Design a protein around this nucleic acid. Structure first.
Lengths: 147, 186, 66, 125, 53, 257
RNA sequence: UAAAGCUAAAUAUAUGUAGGAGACCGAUAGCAAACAAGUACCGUGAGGGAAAGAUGAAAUAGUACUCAGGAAUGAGCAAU
RNA sequence: AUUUUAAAAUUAUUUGAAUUUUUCUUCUUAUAAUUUAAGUUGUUUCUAUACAGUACUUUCUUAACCCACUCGUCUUGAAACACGGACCAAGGAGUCUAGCAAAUGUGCAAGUGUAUAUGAUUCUUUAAACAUUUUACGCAUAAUUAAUGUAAUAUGUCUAUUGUAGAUUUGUGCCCCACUUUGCAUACAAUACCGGUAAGCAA
RNA sequence: CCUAUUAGCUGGUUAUUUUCGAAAGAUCUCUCAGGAUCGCUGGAGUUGAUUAAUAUAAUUUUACCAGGUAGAGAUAAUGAU
RNA sequence: AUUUCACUCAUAUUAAAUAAAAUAACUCCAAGUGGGCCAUUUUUGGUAAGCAGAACUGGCGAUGAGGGAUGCUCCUAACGC
RNA sequence: UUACCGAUACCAAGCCAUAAAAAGAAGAAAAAAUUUUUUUUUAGAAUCUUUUUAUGAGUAGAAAAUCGUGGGGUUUGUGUUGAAGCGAAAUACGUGAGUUUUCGUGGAACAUCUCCCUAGUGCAGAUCUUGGUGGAAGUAGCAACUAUUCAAAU
RNA sequence: GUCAUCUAAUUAGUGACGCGCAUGAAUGGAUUAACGAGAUUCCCACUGUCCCUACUUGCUAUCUAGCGAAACCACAGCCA
């Protein structure tokens, strides 16, 4: 990989592509994020707007396991289960699938997307969106709370 | 001396040759370059041009979008120079004849089960040399995450560009310049 | 030491090197801060037109698909 | 000055020499483009060491062919003349520098009975 | 810094060359552990080395 | 890697402003040749290289498992076509067919003499001669680094059960073995070259289908692996061009300047 | 369930010793040191610290003899 | 090797006409040729009736006419009375790692990467190759808010928001164009819906 | 020995050909020998054009605008004389 | 105001002329640069200056060639062999 | 008032490269001898082939294609009938970096351009590092301490 | 600075004068015999310091035999 490097093609060019006037010096602007708010301020404000300052209150120790909550929208509930069983459930109107999304790894069911019309489906989840539940029972299904 | 733009040489922009050294893709490019030259077909010219494009400019097309685009022509075939990906949000598929570079396994199985079929571009050239009953389609070329960082810099007024940040919590690029309470907003 | 304070020399040919670019002049302009109580009414007009067109099209589709 | 022998035109002879290599022993005559700042040769001052350029390139119809109007092919084996059996009229053969006397004699014999000319025919004898 | 890059965050301001270590012997250690457990399950003569949990 | 502090194990001192000498560090003291000489610096004798080589170079690479399996499948397919093997350099002009497979009793032969005899009787006498006469001492200083010889690669024997193949075909220069369940891309495509002469036992040839998905079994088939699918259905683009359907579509031949 | 105590394994090893290797260096390189090298030598001292490998297959073939020179050497019709 | 063709001109016949009324008058009818077409061909000598020279090719050394200031560098500006260079050899400087992004190639794709680790008649090579009893983890798949949190048309319908341009397709006037048909990507807008904030109401 | 400390400063920075080709303005900066940012430049790519036309133009014409510099004035104002 | 239906307003030279106008437009990544100087014309400070500071355009810089004996900037004219 | 001289500018032609374009995935021509022989060719590589037009300064800077070096895999080679290296060269090739040959020396290894992998990979400079060597130059100089002489021996 | 004196001639010295840029009392003021390789002016003596240079001795230089460096060095070395 070292023979594909751009410095190789400037082998006999004196300045190595770094300029004859400005030269390549050692940290001519500072080190790291040195000049923020002083002479790199234009860069900071143009590319990282809200960088300086603090907002909000502290959460002293977090324990992300408490609030871990993967989500799934209602438009993927039918795609969760295999194609042949999807065909069977759609064909037979006397029975409906009850899907435990927690086993697949989802805690909350969100309401984005379109469910199939007149296809009942029961969903078991730890949390439900209001619109998700509305669509579930609009297509004739039911939401079941589990823990 | 002569006063000419660019010293008098016409300058083209974009790809001139295939970069991929994939022998099958090179054969396909050769075949469709010949087809575009020997026929007048803008169809063949466009396919030859698109077979050359980088990966980001032959994006995947989902099955749902494929069927939605093919909804009003049930008898024609859909030609995509990208890949066809399965869409779990789609409940049912219906009899699609689609030529594409590659099909994901799930999309291929779903199309075959629905009763349509998947075609390669060599078969497309064999059966429809001039693209009769063939609808050229392409996926969203500007939907990728890289494009979300492009355009006006994040910090320009009314800029929708995402910034480059390690994480997106309350304490990462959210204080001064992004809300009125700290200096200015945006 | 004493520095050259200012000059506009070469700025015009720099500007003309990539030409004086003109605004794109799009067909439609956002109406965000323009004439409220007029563009709101225009939204109502468009909704009414769309509702009439859609109901007529739905009637035609239902009567043609039986 | 150009030299013209039959269809062959050599647009320039007397190969370019490195600037100032005539009066510095550490500077070898092999051509190097003077990068410099005020380098005379780089600026193309009159009367000093002109630089090579693509304009001197030879006609590609007669580019690589020798004064015998044939392209040279360097062989180190008797087995490397099979391509020349079908190209005996536009290829001449040259024996590699590190080929022994036995193999040289064999190669000359094969070339003659293949009526392919040999450039360095009388080497090592 | 320059251009539109993420703001640098690299924690290499101490003497890190003394703390770099690279495992050339990952699979060698795999073999050694496998050999050791094979040897002890041969030594105990039939009874498994695993314990019920 | 070089020794960690190589060239920097002297006393640092560059007293060189006004001494009429370059400002490079000089070793101190006197009474020896080293005193006053240029100390550490890539341009100084005994001064330490520019960027000392380190052991934390990226020695290895992580290769996608799917790409590795694709490469192995492609190498097998390439070994299956006669022209590719000839191009790679095996003298196979006399064997009957290039996906050649032999009875499972090859796995049981145990004498190198009879292994060579079988190889010759298959029609690979020229291949064996090439292998045996390719042996010769390499150029360069690699031969003082335990790399004395350089051999050419011959047939790769792929077996299922080792009943003597391993200790019958080794010691034949350029010949290597490989169990069918542990196929190695390094052996299948030496140097990245395409298509190696492969001698399959019948059992290994049959087991290939089991390994790659047909008639699967629990502990043999690659779990949930699907063979790569081609971009083109049939690469005979000139046959498709000469097909009458596209021949009718082609316009009349036009003329150059 | 503090203010008493013990305890193997998985872990680390720019040291010493001993093995084995390398897409490493090939005598201004590689350890400072391929060698009589931390030696010679320098500094009151703490310390500083080199240079230096190759006849030939075989010297169990290391130049016999003669001439000229005080000798070193040189020359030979002499010699490995 | 299927335009050095066709024609154009000219010559020799030939048909009719015109006319400036003719030994270069013009326009065609047919034939046969030629080049002024359709980028140089011919003759005679010499080399030479030799196997390397006094010739021819070439290298070098010398002259001669014209031209030619010391290179590198900083600099607006260097041949500079600016600095470095007495000479030669060998050594001698954008690299390595981490992390991010863009670009491009490759594999798979709403998934992707099998991490550490395990097994295996693999154990010179091999410290690599191969493999992983039907929710490990990272990134992505959803955003927004300091935050309790909340979380994307909405069950009239397996239609999949609406326009203006727009690729491709469909027919009518298998290859020119104007009407039809469809409406990718994308651009410009409009709409809904989600989170936050205002405002109104608020059991 | 930490330490190959740091240096916005000086010096150096190694093959060929080909193609494209600058800036020495500007804004902010404990800034004035520096830096970030814009401009100028290269490379990559797409959309277009390839239809002697449309987009387009350091150009003119036609139509319509805006100006208070040169000139003029001192008897029109102000200020001089 | 929007939407849908009608009719039709030069295009066969193109709703004025001309146009090696698509060598366009756009997007991404990034280099160098951010000491300038000179000439014509205009112009401020200064007795003035090869002085200091500005405006337009062209150059020098970054560029050789012919001429001005000579000359970084003048005239002609910009450069493959 | 004429004529003339006078550029790397202009014009015509050739050739190189760059850019763009038009187009393209199978058959006998000639000559020399004497119906028969002989001599050449008888093409089809798509980052390719043929043809056409325009164009070509360039620091800082960018890119592409090339040329070399140590080492690795693959392939296929040269060496005691003399390898590497080195000196001088060549009717040699290239525009050029270079490549390839000859003679001499040398006395044991050396390439791989088939494709690829890898790097401690290319020097005129750094008051560069180490070593060697110059002109200065048979020059400066061998100047304190009063002073030596005759004969003999070795 | 002005006035005397010193000289032929005095930006020097000494003695006086004092609205003293900006003197002054252990920041010590004023004065002092003796002392000083301390600074300064004048006089006598003395003389090559000079008018104005000359001659002369030793040791070098010089030529020879022998021995034998170095600094400096882009390339070099006539001028208007």
């Amino acid at each position: 990989a070292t023979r594909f490097k751009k410095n190789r093609k400037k082998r006999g060019h004196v300045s190595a592509g770094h300029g004859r006037v400005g030269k390549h010096r050692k940290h001519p602007g500072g080190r790291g994020k040195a000049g923020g708010l002083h002479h790199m301020r234009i860069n900071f404000d143009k590319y990282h707007p809200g960088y300086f300052g603090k907002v909000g209150m502290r959460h002293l120790n977090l324990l992300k396991n408490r609030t871990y909550c993967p989500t799934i929208n209602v438009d993927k509930l039918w795609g969760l289960l295999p194609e042949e069983k999807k065909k069977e459930f759609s064909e037979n109107k006397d029975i409906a699938p009850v899907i435990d999304v927690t086993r697949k790894g989802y805690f909350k069911v969100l309401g984005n997307g379109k469910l199939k019309h007149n296809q009942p489906i029961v969903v078991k989840a730890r949390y439900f969106s209001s619109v998700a539940e509305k669509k579930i029972k609009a297509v004739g299904g039911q939401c079941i709370l589990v823990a | 001396g002569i006063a000419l733009k660019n010293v008098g040489r016409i300058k083209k922009h974009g790809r001139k040759h295939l970069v991929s050294k994939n022998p099958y893709l090179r054969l396909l490019v050769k075949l469709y370059n010949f087809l575009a030259r020997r026929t007048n077909a803008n169809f063949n010219k466009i396919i030859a041009k698109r077979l050359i494009m980088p990966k980001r400019y032959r994006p995947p097309l989902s099955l749902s979008k494929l069927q939605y685009h093919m909804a009003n022509h049930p008898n024609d075939i859909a030609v995509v120079v990208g890949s066809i990906t399965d869409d779990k949000r789609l409940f049912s598929l219906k009899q699609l004849k689609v030529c594409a570079l590659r099909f994901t396994e799930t999309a291929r199985k779903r199309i075959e089960d629905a009763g349509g079929e998947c075609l390669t571009f060599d078969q497309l050239a064999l059966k429809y040399p001039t693209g009769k009953k063939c609808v050229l389609l392409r996926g969203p070329t500007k939907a990728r995450t890289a494009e979300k960082h492009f355009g006006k810099a994040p910090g320009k007024p009314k800029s929708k560009a995402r910034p480059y940040v390690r994480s997106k919590g309350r304490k990462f690029e959210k204080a001064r310049g992004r809300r009125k309470s700290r200096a200015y907003k945006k | 030491a004493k520095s050259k304070n200012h000059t506009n020399h070469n700025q015009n040919r720099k500007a003309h090197k990539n030409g004086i670019k003109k605004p794109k002049k799009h067909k439609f302009m956002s109406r965000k801060g323009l004439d409220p109580n007029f563009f709101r009414n225009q939204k109502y007009c468009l909704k009414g037109i769309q509702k009439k067109k859609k109901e007529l099209k739905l009637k035609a589709k239902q009567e043609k698909n039986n | 000055a150009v030299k013209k022998v039959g269809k062959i035109i050599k647009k320039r002879t007397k190969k370019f020499t490195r600037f100032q290599s005539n009066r510095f022993m550490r500077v070898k005559p092999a051509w190097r483009k003077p990068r410099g700042i005020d380098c005379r040769v780089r600026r193309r001052y009159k009367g000093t060491n002109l630089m090579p350029s693509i304009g001197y390139g030879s006609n590609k119809k007669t580019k690589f062919l020798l004064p015998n109007n044939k392209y040279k092919y360097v062989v180190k084996n008797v087995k490397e003349m099979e391509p020349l059996i079908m190209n005996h009229t536009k290829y001449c053969v040259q024996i590699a520098h590190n080929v022994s006397s036995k193999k040289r004699k064999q190669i000359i014999e094969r070339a003659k009975q293949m009526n392919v000319s040999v450039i360095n025919a009388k080497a090592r004898l | 810094v320059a251009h539109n890059n993420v703001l640098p965050n690299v924690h290499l301001h101490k003497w890190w060359q003394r703390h770099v270590r690279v495992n050339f012997s990952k699979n060698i250690k795999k073999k050694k552990r496998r050999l050791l457990r094979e040897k002890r399950r041969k030594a105990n003569g039939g009874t498994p080395i695993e314990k019920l949990h | 890697a070089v020794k960690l502090g190589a060239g920097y194990e002297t006393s640092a001192e560059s007293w060189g402003t006004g001494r009429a000498v370059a400002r490079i560090p000089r070793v101190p003291g006197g009474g020896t040749h080293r005193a006053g000489q240029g100390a550490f610096g890539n341009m100084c004798r005994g001064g330490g290289m520019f960027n000392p080589t380190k052991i934390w170079r990226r020695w290895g690479r992580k290769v996608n498992l799917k790409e590795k399996r694709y490469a192995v499948c492609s190498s097998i397919a390439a070994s299956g076509v006669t022209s590719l093997v000839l191009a790679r350099g095996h003298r196979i002009s006399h064997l009957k067919e290039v996906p050649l497979v032999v009875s499972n009793d090859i796995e049981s032969l145990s004498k190198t003499k009879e292994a060579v005899n079988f190889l010759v009787s298959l029609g690979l006498k020229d291949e064996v001669n090439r292998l045996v006469k390719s042996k010769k001492i390499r150029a360069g200083k690699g031969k003082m680094r335990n790399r004395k010889y350089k051999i050419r690669n011959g047939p790769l024997i792929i077996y299922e059960n080792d009943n003597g193949v391993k200790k019958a075909f080794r010691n034949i220069p350029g010949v290597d073995l490989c169990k069918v369940t542990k196929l190695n891309l390094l052996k299948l495509a030496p140097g990245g070259s395409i298509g190696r002469l492969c001698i399959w036992s019948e059992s290994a040839f049959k087991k290939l289908d089991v390994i790659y998905g047909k008639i699967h079994e629990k502990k043999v088939t690659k779990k949930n692996y699907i063979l790569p699918k081609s971009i083109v259905h049939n690469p005979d683009i000139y046959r498709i061009i000469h097909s009458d359907k596209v021949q009718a579509s082609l316009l009349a031949k036009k003329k150059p300047c």
